[PDB]
Amino acid sequence: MKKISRKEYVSMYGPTTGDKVRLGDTDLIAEVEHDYTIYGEELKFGGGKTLREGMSQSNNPSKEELDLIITNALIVDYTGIYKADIGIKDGKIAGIGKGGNKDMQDGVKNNLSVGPATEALAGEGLIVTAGGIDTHIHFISPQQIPTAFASGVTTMIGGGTGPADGTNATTITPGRRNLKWMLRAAEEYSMNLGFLAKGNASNDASLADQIEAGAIGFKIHEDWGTTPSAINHALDVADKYDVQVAIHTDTLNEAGCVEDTMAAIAGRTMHTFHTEGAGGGHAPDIIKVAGEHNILPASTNPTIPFTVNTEAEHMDMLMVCHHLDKSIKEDVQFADSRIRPQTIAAEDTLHDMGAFSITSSDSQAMGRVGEVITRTWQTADKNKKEFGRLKEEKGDNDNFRIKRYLSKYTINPAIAHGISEYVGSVEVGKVADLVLWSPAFFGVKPNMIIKGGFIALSQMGDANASIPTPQPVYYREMFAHHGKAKYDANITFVSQAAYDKGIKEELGLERQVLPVKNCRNVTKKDMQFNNTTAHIEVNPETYHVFVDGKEVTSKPANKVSLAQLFSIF
Amino acid sequence: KTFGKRLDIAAGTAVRFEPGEEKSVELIDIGGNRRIFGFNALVDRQADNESKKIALHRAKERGFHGAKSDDNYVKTIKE
Amino acid sequence: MKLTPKELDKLMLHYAGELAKKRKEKGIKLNYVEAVALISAHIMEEARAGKKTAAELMQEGRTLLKPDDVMDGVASMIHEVGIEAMFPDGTKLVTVHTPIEANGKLVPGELFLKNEDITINEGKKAVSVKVKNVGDRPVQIGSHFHFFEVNRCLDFDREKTFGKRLDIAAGTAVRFEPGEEKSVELIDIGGNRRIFGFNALVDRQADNESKKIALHRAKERGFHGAKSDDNYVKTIKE
Ligand code: NI
Ligand code: NI
Fold first, then answer.
1. CATH topology of domain A131-424+483-568
2. The CATH number of the domain where C48 resides is what?
3. Does A138 count as an annotated binding residue?
4. A2-130+425-482 maps to which CATH number?
5. Which residues on chain B are in Cβ contact (under 8 Å) with C235?
6. How far apart are CA C98 and CA C126, in angstroms?
7. Where in chain A is the domain with CATH 3.20.20.140?
8. Within an 8 Å CB–CB cutoff, is residue B39 touching chain A?
9. Cα A531 to chain centroid, rounded
10. Of A519, A436, A16, A567, residue with least CA distance to A237
């Protein structure tokens, strides 16, 4: 029973229990909480390695023989930041533990058995995390998909029909016809998709068809008329059809104020976008909504993290979203009374306190579809700087905080739109949407994006070279991104109603197709870690944001992690 | 006095009111079939002098400033 | 003699009894079954002869077997013996309670719980409230019932009780005799705090704003303590 030194061990199998990893260049320190291996029996593939016939690979596999093994993987998920082997079978997470060959290994469950049929993927040294799920996508251009994908985003929930104004302003694919188109278009892409409908309508009839037509929910956007009527109608139908509903509060306050909007929501579940304010909504309050139970708070994107140039930026954007032509009087008045450095500031803090739960993007509409994950982390690193560790933190690490910022674009959005059963976290049973992160580039530049248990895109080099490592090394589409293969590795979400009515056959969808569920039964308390409720106020004058009594405001930054250190642009 | 009317201005634009600000807007009647549906759920019908009674009544109960008062309101069979 | 399956059931039981009696007779400590039967079988005949009453047999059965008659454990086992027999007035349920006793030290499946106390509803800041039954009939409210919506007779501050349940053992309840006045203990409802049903007062999320409505409706519906309508501003949904 010889013994080796961690020094070695780690370079061999990766950080084990008690060890700590630095997320990218941020001051966020992760610590391996647990490890499922059996020191001396760990899986290694290569020349004369372990994963070989009769050895680590059973010649008498279990009738569950894995399709693919990700050896020695450091798992950072809302369920823990531990170590272990991740197994994949039939496009799903078949098992998470030891695994190898029961014929020669002490603790290998038929769940994680390695056989002639299972491929080997090294993971030691890397950090495996579930794919992100940006849920505030404005389907303006099909080019976002790929970009977002390169981020660490496997699922995109939004509304829209291309570079059309209605779409440029709101994430809504209006009507069942336009719905058909996108669902049919979706077939093309490598990235789970779900579309939202126009909640903006006080016509129950017209409101139900879109859901029966594939929509996983509704969206109430200011540009379409976010009135209490619309708001109420949408909400009710949403209940009947067990589907989610997003909202972009009535800024101009024409119909009323948040008081009214909240009164309309009648306590029903509601996923709020750019809650903070800059993204749009009831000026100035709104952000105060993120403190209520029935609300699913979400942060936009640009106003995160808080840097010296943030405020100086937004002034424009409004124009290129609400058709706020840079000239008109009425326009050039509110657009200015919305980008409050106040609300913008507290945000970060609110995100730290668990006041906010999701981190959208708003792709091409006041948000970077490729900067969700990155920012979520910066914003974390930042907060740590200014506030230090957290009270809930245990041990010399930031695990708890990590697991908070992480589930902000993984498990929390998945729940927000009833798809937490299939995706959103590295847990056995769910769809194998995983991404391997090389510690140094965590939160910004992922190694590979495996979709539905099979590589869809990864960092690839000189296709002509003698090895995959040599430059140019950018992201290149992978097999599960082509042919019929794509069809097998992706899921286009829709509603039960549609699912049952056979929307799949109806529209000849070849893509996998599942229905969204459990969307009306959830509340703020259903948000992992970020489940904090707390009556907040906002001074109409100073605009200062108060919570429970105390005042919350982060300090603007002059530099951020995960930036210029990694991209030539 | 405003029942069934819209700010007589360029189609699209709007009017702003700063907390406190006081003005006299210009507002013409709504054209088309004059079928109000939605907004604040006050009408949701045809702009009628009789439908009006209801709107005025509801706004009273709902709290909109200027919504006169309920001088012994005679309820109808649908509202 | 049209024999009902019910009758056969008994004819069988009866002899199950005869064996029993016939065994101890020969001097043998009766076991679980044997006791049970015997006891039961007795009542059946007793009801037949039409002499003793239900009330009586219910008691007299406790005098059929001495703690030295049965085996060690039997006593503890037979918590009670239920048996319906046909009395001249009709079939009746003679329930014989604890017919024998712990004349032994053995007790099958006995419980060795570890002394100490369990704290119900951990950290849940309770609150007392005056509650008087101004009605002619009694009222038992339960553990997880939205107190605020209790019978429109329990006069108290509904307002102070919005979204709360009698801080007591999960399951049990509190009784109010017409007239009786007390101060119940009631913590906030946990979970997502989604009140739906009961008296139809909330049917939403326990909100300080949803509250306004509940308080308003209870006023119109007549629940004592439901404050009053100080010029209530109606909402677009309620
Ligand atoms: Ni928006
Ligand atoms: Ni948007």
1. TIM Barrel (3.20.20)
2. 3.30.280.10
3. yes
4. 2.30.40.10
5. 62
6. 40
7. 131-424+483-568
8. yes
9. 17
10. A519
